[PDB]
Every structure is written in C-alpha cells, then in structure tokens.
Amino acid sequence: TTSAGESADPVTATVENYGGETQVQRRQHTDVSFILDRFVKVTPKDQINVLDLMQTPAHTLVGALLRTATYYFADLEVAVKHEGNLTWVPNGAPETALDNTTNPTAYHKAPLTRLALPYTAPHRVLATAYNGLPTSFNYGAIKATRVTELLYRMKRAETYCPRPLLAIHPSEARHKQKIVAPVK
Amino acid sequence: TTSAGESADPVTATVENYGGETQVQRRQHTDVSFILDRFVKVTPKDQINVLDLMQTPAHTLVGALLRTATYYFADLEVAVKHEGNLTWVPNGAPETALDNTTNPTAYHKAPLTRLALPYTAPHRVLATAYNGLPTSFNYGAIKATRVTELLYRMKRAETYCPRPLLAIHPSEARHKQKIVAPVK
Amino acid sequence: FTGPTDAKARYMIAYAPPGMEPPKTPEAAAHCIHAEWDTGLNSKFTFSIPYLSAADYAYTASDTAETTNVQGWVCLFQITHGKADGDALVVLASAGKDFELRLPVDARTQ
Amino acid sequence: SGNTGSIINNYYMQQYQNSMDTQLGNDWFSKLASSAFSGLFGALLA
Amino acid sequence: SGNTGSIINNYYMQQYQNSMDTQLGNDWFSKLASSAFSGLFGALLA
Amino acid sequence: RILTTRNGHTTSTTQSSVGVTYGYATTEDFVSGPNTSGLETRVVQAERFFKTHLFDWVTSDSFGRCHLLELPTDHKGVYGSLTDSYAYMRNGWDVEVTAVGNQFNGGCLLVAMVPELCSINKRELYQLTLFPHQFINPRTNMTAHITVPFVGVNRYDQYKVHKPWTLVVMVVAPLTVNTEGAPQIKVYANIAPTNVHVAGEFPSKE
Amino acid sequence: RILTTRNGHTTSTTQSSVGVTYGYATTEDFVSGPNTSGLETRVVQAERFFKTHLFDWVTSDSFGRCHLLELPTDHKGVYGSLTDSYAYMRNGWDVEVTAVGNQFNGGCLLVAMVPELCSINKRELYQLTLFPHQFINPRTNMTAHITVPFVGVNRYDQYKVHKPWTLVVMVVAPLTVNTEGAPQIKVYANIAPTNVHVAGEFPSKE
Question: Can you list the domains of chain B with their CATH numbers?
Fold first, then answer.
C-alpha cells in the first residue's frame, strides 16, 4: 500500500493485500479502565502520606500506563496497613487537619484497611506533565501512627493526550528473560 | 453373540441372549467433569511453584484419570497454605514478574487461600503426552515466602483421545486389601 | 522514502517463517511471502506482516534461557537504486487491524 | 455441570469466574458406545 | 466498566460510592483509528 | 469382502476387507483458523499412497513385540517436498497394513494408530485396544484399513519437530506354520495423507 | 501511473507503469485435451514471482547487444520441484523487467518475449518489435510488464528438452550519463508463471 507518508494520516495495511484475510480481535485487556483498575504499591512515608499518583514507580504497570497520558481522571481506592487510626483529609486541607478524628478516620482492624476516596481536586482533570514537578494537585492525605504498606487503585479511569512508553533497551539483539516453565 | 471379532466394531452382549433382562444404569459418577472436580494435593516447592497438572502423582485418582486422556481442557482452582503473600503470574510471564504485587496477589489470611484461575495457555487444549517431558504449557506460576500445601481442582474438564489405565498387579490371584469394617 | 527527486530505489520486504535459517539474497527470499515496491510520487508503503503460527497466541518475550528465533524473521532487501547513494529510508511500526494483546503482567522497567 | 450443587446464582459474572469459550466457523465415544451391535447374528431357535 | 464483575447491585448509592459527574452546555483515537485508509492507492492487476 | 480404496491417482483393491475403522472422527475439523490468517493452501497432489516395509513376523516373535512407525516418515515424493517448502501443515492419515500369508497360518496382529506415542510400557499393551485399531487374523483377513484425522494441541503442526501419529503393530498371538502355512509373513504398510493443508512457505536454498 | 500486480502471495507495486502488454492472447487456451485423458492437476502454489539478475547496462554497450533468458530457468522453489516431479507441464508467463536509473539518463531498452528463439541475426533485431514487447525509457519509465500464454506444437510441453519462451532484452539506444545521471543501470527480471498444469508424475529417487 503506497501513500503520502508525510501527510500523517493513519494508514493501515492488511494481509488481504497479498491474499490473506483479517481475523477477529478481542481487545478487552488494552482498554484504559480495565488495565488501570488494579492495586499498585508505593513506598509510604512514616506518618504523613500525601496521596498523589506520581508516587507510583515509573517501571510498574499502573505507573507507566498512567504516565502514558497527559491528562487523567480517576476516583481512588486505597488499601493501607497501619498502626493506630488512619485519617484522611481532602484536597486543600491543612496538615493540622490530619490530627482530628472528625475527618474520615478508619479505626484499626486487622490486617488492613480498604477504603474508597472520591475525586476532590479543583481541576477538571489532573496532569502527568505540567510545564509551569507539577502543581499541588492530589487526592488528599492520610496519616497514622506508622504506615507500613500503601496501595493505590484507579477506578473510572479516563486518559487524554497520549505520551511515549519506553521498553527496556537490550544489549544484544533481543531482550531475553527467564519465562516461567517446568524443569521437566 | 457371534461376530467378526477382527473388524473392531463395538459389539455388546446382553443377558437377554440367555433369557435375562437388562436393567437401568446410573452413571453420574464416571463422567469426566464430576470425577475430576475435586482437590488433589501435590508436593510443593519452597517458593516458586509452576502450575502444571503433571505435578499430580500418577497413582492418585485425579492424576491417573487425568493421564487417561491425551488432550484436556480445564479451568483451575488452587488452595494454598503459605507464609507471606501469594503471587500468581499467567502463562508466558517472566519469573521476575513473580516479584511484583500488581500481578494477582492474595494477602495472607488464616488458614489457607482458595482462588480460581482461568485457562491462560496459548493452545486450544493441553496435552498429557507430547511426542516432540512435554512442551512448556501450564497454568502460570505462584510464589510466596514459603508454600507448605498445594491443592489443585480441575473445573469444566474436557478430555480427548483416551489412553490406558493400569491397576495394581497382584502377586496371588486376587489383590486383597483391608476394607474398613467394624471389629465386632 | 526521504531521498531527493533524482534518487530512485526499489525495495523488497519478506517474511521468513520459523523452521529454517532466513535468506541472505532477494532471489532466495522471492519464495517467501514478500512485497516489492519502488519510489515515486507516493513516498510511503505499508506492508502487513501476518500472524502465522501453530498456536493462535504468541508470547511477547523469552525469559532468558533459550529459543532460537521463534515467530520467524522480517527481511528488508533493496533491489535496485539509481543515484540513491546515502539517502534515508525511514520506517515506522504500528498495530494491524486484527492485532490483539492479552494477559496483563508486570515484570519491571516502566 | 461438574461437582457444583448451589441453587443460588453466582455473585460474580461469567466473565470473571471462568474462561470464556470461542466458537469457530460425550461425544464420540457416546456415539461409538450407542452404535454397539446388541442382538444376535444367526437364526435364533427356541 | 473497569475491573468489576459483580452481578448484584451495590449496597451503597451512587452518591457515596463515586464522584458524581457534571455536564456542561474511545473517543478521538477510536475515530482516528477507524478512519485509517485500508485499501490500495493504485490500480491492482492480477 | 471386496473393497477398492483410492487416493489421488493411486488405487488399492483388497478382497479380505473386514471394514474400514474411522478413528476419533469421520469428518475433518475446521481448517481455516485464526492462527494463520487465511494464508492456507490445499495440496491435492500430495494425497496419494506411499509404501513402507514395516517388519517381518516369524514364529520366534512372542506376545508384545511392537513395531512403531512415527508419521510422517521419510518421503521422497511430493509430500516430502511439502515439508521442506512450508512451515505449517495439517493432515489425517489413511493407513492400510497388509500381512500376506495364507489361511493355514495362525496367530493374530493388532494394528493401531496412537496419538503421541512417546513412551510405551508392557502392561498397557494390554489396553492397546483403546486406540483406533484392527486385527489381522490370517484365518480370515490379511488387510487392515484405518482412517484417522489430524489431532493436536495446535490446529496446524510443524512436522520437523513434532510427529503426532504413531502406527504400532503388535503380535497378540504368535505365528504358527501348521503343515500348509507360510513360514514367515512380511508385513507392509500402505499410507496416504488426507486433506493436507500448508501455510508459511520457506525461502529456498538456491 | 501506479500499478500493483499480484501472483499468489507475492506483490509487486510500480509507479512508472506505462501499461501491461498482453501478447498473442488475453485468455488461456483449452487445457484439458485428448492427449492426457483428464489426468491433469492445477498447481496454485507455483504461480508466484521469482527474481533473476539479467545484465548490467553501461555506456560502452552499443546498439544490438542482447541478453537472452530461456524460460523456464533454474528455479529452487515449488515451480522447480514441479519439473522434477511431473512429465508434462503448461504455463504462461508474467514478466516484469526493471531497469532503475534516474530520469537524467538517456537511451532506451526493448524487452520482448520471443517464442522459440533458437537463432537470431543482427538485421532481424531491427524487427524485434514484431514480438510482444515494451520499451524501457529512463526519461519516462523503469518498468516493463508483459503477460503471455503458452504456445507450442503440443498443448503440453516437457520442459527438460524444450523451452518455448525467450526473454530478450536489447539496447536500442545506448546509455548516457549526462551530468546528473546514474553511471550504470543493473537490469533485473521478475517473472511469475501463470495457469500452470502438470501431468504424468514421475517415480522418486528415494
């Protein structure tokens, strides 16, 4: 299939150009809302954990596929292992508001605490890259006596204006791994 | 009932050939999906357990009735006693993917963890004998800090092209066992 | 093709399926699934590498140990050129119409 | 179908409980066992 | 919509489970991918 | 019991035909799958008989001496050229095994098509009847005819690394040379692939 | 002037296509004749392109230097295996000759398909236009496309003793390298047989 390659219109070619037939596709694993709706762990601080999604590592699945977008919308789901009582404050709250139990405070029950947090930012969408370290937009903050594990989960995820993904660069021709297989 | 015995057509004879009558049968215990839908224990490794159904012993019920087929289809059900957090990766995943919690990770709750795993192989059916130790086809892998007990359960089992079953060969005319009975 | 208007060329793209070693000559690759094109007014040519495999799904990597070169080879050959000495042929890659990608996993390297 | 005996429908959808089958375009030994010659071959006297 | 597979409706209302959207007054790359030129440009012989 | 079977331009007529055993299916499964994207071709020139010496059955051969023939075999015809030209193939097999003695011999052979016969024991030879099979009994016949389709974990197979079918021939009763019988029986195979399909043509060596 | 030609699973796209010259017929003649008694087979896998270096056209080459290519050629693909398997064959030819320079060269080539070119003179090169032909003029094109059927005294031919077609390429005006032109033009052939038919399969060597 010849075309004007500089016009940047999307041009796809099929196998039917040389006598094949294009088959059916199931793309339910590469859609945005499905693939981002899973927990990813971040390294927590000792007490105060500002909840923004740039604490996710960039080499993880949710981190890299999150940083694929320029803009995003999500509600948040957090699962915290903590000592004492976990306290959440929304976006724009002072840090002394983290010392009050009238703010949403989940008392300790073993082994962890799983709670749903809404979108509390004053912006219509958030950003992965801000021209202007982006602006102080986040999902509030939590604190306990100590926080040992902190998980995020993006739900109702929407993404806008895609940005590059980079795979690992091999030293030889192919990047080889040890794919799991039985010994015998 | 006389026939051509070399033609290998199926020929059954009844008691009605000598004045009897054939009775009704209930065969709900020898069908494939019922008899294979039960847990069988395998010997686990210390951390990494590649989930394939040839870890089942050949003298068990599910192992021998599994190895009766050439081809099979099943979803999988696993019940694991483990220390730490149990992590599952699908078929084709690297082993370093077993070190990440974004993959399906069941946190520890006493006494065990029972979870359902789908069919994740790129083949239409799996194999008990491969002409070519068969090829690396399996149901993924799990790991924890240590795994103490590992159970399988085949659900929606389908079997194709049957192969031999062998009973134990007695030394005298009949294989005698101690069938459970009261002393008095 | 990003050469000048007085630079002409003729290229050949071929698909070597796995099972034997890939060709080194376009006359040897003429017995494959191939497509040949030349430069002109339309500068871009799109070729659709097909999914030929025994299984209907293929792995996206090897762990580390050993596969030889499974799923075959993509072979770019040039046939002729006229005053195309040192010009560039740039190449993009994208998913096909029936391209699908399943079983999510996290290994490393964001 | 197998060793399941609950009468209440499942809480999870079929997309999340099992793998979904795909059509293209029991079961042989049932027909091979049902096609078994059962009578007599010769001429039955008495 | 996402990675949810329960068939029983939620115990909590929509006002308490999620943030509620507001109207004023997928989705571009679906139309950009569907508008891809798929055929041939020249005159196909044989 | 006269039967004439024909593949391509090759004909085989027998007069001791107890029947044809269709194993595991009578028809072929669905050929055009999603794994080759419609790039298939049926080769009508490759579905014809080829011959192979199998073994020689004598009186010293007791119960359970097998002969295994992994299909496909070394083939110098068109079907052999299909394996060096294409990456993926698909076929069933039409197997016709002859053991010519006379009707004054005894003993009995069991011929069977086994899928993926990678290892065999002694005791499970006792259940070799579980596979598509016929008996060759020199009292009655000297011809066994077994037709069978393609099986596998993949719908197309690459035959240079995997051979799915195995023709096994087993002595279930040893040969006798009662006073008018033949002293030994040379056993022959007459095999023809059915419904072959190729995909993914190779580069040449020229 | 964009034209895409396709044979089998092989595609060739050109952008200097002055046209396709159908020589001596546009359709094929009657295939099933009384000389083979209906034992024919069409091989769909053999109708695809193969490539051949033809010669190199330089400035020292004057008027009338020919290059002759007797069809069929040494072929390592499926079509070569058809000649060592069957006794009688039949095909037309789809010949696509390329001479890539640039539009600042001069000169002119004449490509032609000649039936039974066993001897050629000098003066009758002057009438090489009487055969199916196209000109390759680097001022305008670099591609010539000639399609032609099977001819002969017999409706099936045996190609190991007789080669009916000959692709002749002749310089009718010598090459110029005017200041922006290419210094030489390597000339290539891209040939594909059409509507092949085989009959009378050989014994093997195995």
Answer: 1-184 (2.60.120.20)
